[PDB]
Structure 1
Amino acid sequence: KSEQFEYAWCLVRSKYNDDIRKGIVLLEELLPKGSKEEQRDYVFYLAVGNYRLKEYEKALKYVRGLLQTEPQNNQAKELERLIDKAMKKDGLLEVLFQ
């Protein structure tokens, strides 16, 4: 189980979008199985994976879910601040042609 995560961790790291989609799904499967601390890590990495796929909605959903339980996790705060920059630049680009 602690190695089924390492696989998904490497997968959510990969340069190929398909390895990333596979990495999330393995993390979504490992999520109810997990412990308190394990779920906090899995959720963080699900936000990382969803962000690397421009799925910024779902990525913000996780990182805020974690930030409600851990308001002072600075790495979660930094990941939420990176999701906000991508979304506001993306929203600017969308409406550039009016």
Structure 2
Amino acid sequence: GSMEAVLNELVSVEDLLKFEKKFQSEKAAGSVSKSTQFEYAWCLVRSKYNDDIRKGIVLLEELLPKGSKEEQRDYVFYLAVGNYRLKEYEKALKYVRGLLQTEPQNNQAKELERLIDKAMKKDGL
């Protein structure tokens, strides 16, 4: 599908609250999983609200050294998304260019790079 649609997607209230409650439950139990932390962070970085996106970025950065290679690909993609949403354009490009270093022919990553750069330059940065 469309990278622009995925990059600009806003999570629903219902899904954000569903995975927030799931994360809170595991944290209460003292047994947080990479899977649930990622599901919650995936919702947070797609929120309309700055404080949510910032929290989602922290949760993804926590996951990064714990992920297998196939997991880290997902974390880095949504770290690019989340930083883009905060106008952390430099960091967003750093994350996507890391992905491209490992996957130079990944044109989905290339399109994400274009969409971040377009926004950054539109903002005068």
TM-score of the aligned structures, taking structure 1 as reference length: 0.89
Instruction: Name 1:79's counterpart in structure 2.
Output: 112
Cα distance in structure 2, aligned partners of 1:76 and 1:3: 25
Quick one: distance in 1 between partners of 2:123 and 2:40? 31
Q: Give, in angstroms, the shift of residue 74 of structure 1.
A: 2.0
Q: What do the CA deviations read for 1:5-30 (whole angstroms, capped 9, x no partner)?
A: 00010111111110000000000000
Task: Give the TM-score normalised by the residue count of structure 2.
Answer: 0.70
Following the alignment from structure 1 to structure 2, what is the Cα–Cα distance between the partners of residues 18 and 73? Answer: 31
5+ residue gaps in structure 1?
92-98
Identity of aligned residues (%): 99
1:23-62 C-alpha deviation (Å, 9 max, x unpaired): 0000000000000011111001000000010110000000
Q: Unmatched 5+ residue regions in structure 2?
A: 1-33
1:40 and 1:33 map into 2 onto residues whose CA distance is: 12
Distance 1:3 1:73 in 2: 27
SS in 1 for 2:35: coil
CA RMSD of aligned residues (A): 0.8
- Counting matched residue pairs gives 91
1:53-78, Cα deviation, whole Å (9 max, x unpaired):
01100000000011010012222111
